[PDB]
Subunit: 115 residues, 4 copies
């Protein structure tokens, strides 16, 4: 699968499980159309978001519902969500992993692009 998401919890030192993730693609009219979504597994990973045929070049937005994650744990969060926006460009075979590390008042995200 060409697009995978991984979410970690920096407070409990664990995968962030059951985190809702929504993927949008930028449309011609510059609005965000829903493209794919899911929830992270017990490993904190979300697989099977899309397929190679559907994942074309374009501008994508990945919204991670961090606020619901923290509220389910009884921990007070700062952000409404974590939003990752990027251009996917074919430059040879590419697989994208979007990884996020979450704290109540901070998040880090990084992209791992492999052949």
């Amino acid at each position: 699968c060409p697009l995978m998401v991984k979410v970690l919890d920096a407070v409990r030192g664990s995968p962030a499980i059951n985190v809702a993730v929504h993927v949008f693609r930028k449309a011609a009219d510059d609005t965000w159309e829903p493209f794919a979504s899911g929830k992270t597994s017990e490993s904190g990973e979300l697989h099977g978001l899309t397929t190679e045929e559907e994942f074309v070049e374009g501008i994508y937005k990945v919204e991670i519902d961090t606020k619901s994650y923290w509220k389910a744990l009884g921990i007070s969060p700062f952000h409404e969500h974590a939003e990752v926006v990027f251009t996917a460009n074919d430059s040879g075979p590419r697989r994208y992993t979007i990884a996020a590390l979450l704290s109540p008042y901070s998040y880090s995200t990084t992209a791992v692009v492999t052949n």
Copy 2:
């Protein structure tokens, strides 16, 4: 100064200078109203975005134009921008520092909220 933004460059180990920052506020009709904008200084800091009177309760979006930053350095970056979304002043006025650390394929953001 109720809202301040600080941006660092993890590649060169320096302040990220002249980074454009745009602040939006969610309006009654659920759209993003432009609220304030500016550029980081030579210290990587952006002061004077707003005032105590203007910075009311609401949902705010801080969009840091990381892509233009890297491209001005001749680097093709992964993200379009770094976007921080949060509810402000829900329990009275606070002072918010939004700090961002930038790499071409990664960023971290953190919030410092003081009374």
Copy 3:
């Protein structure tokens, strides 16, 4: 395997491959004795460092040779290495993943502890 290391490159958006990793355990005389070592694979992962029988409770040090990594890429690094020091404590079945995200002037590390 009870202890795994994963290293990512925030500049190129990729696994950090062929990164030397050394594990030390704190000895009775408070000196660091060599315990295990290896190099990250093409996925940026180092498996097979130790076994369940050998990985007892104690204070461990994980040294990641970030400086050699950056020098092999022709990129100017700040740190001599990335060093992660922690106490491993049996509290039920535990597997430890030490993950590191590298930039020339910054690194992040996090621990993922799972059952």
Copy 4:
């Protein structure tokens, strides 16, 4: 002030106050000589560690006592400390800011080097 340290708490979104910081310098006999130490202030900043005259070229180690910080907050953290090791002033005197962002199972560190 050639060497400054700043520490933030990613859980509470605040400066990490009263964090002990110890600086060592690698000696001729390849041991770590104690060089300077202090505690972060109410702003999370530690100033006045050393002087321009005392901060000569060398390999330095900044050990941030994160464990005592979390334990004073009643939290059992993963790391013993956060340790930053770097060669300083190799091409003349520089000003170094060592910034650290803390979570119970994670930390990030970054260096800001200015002339």
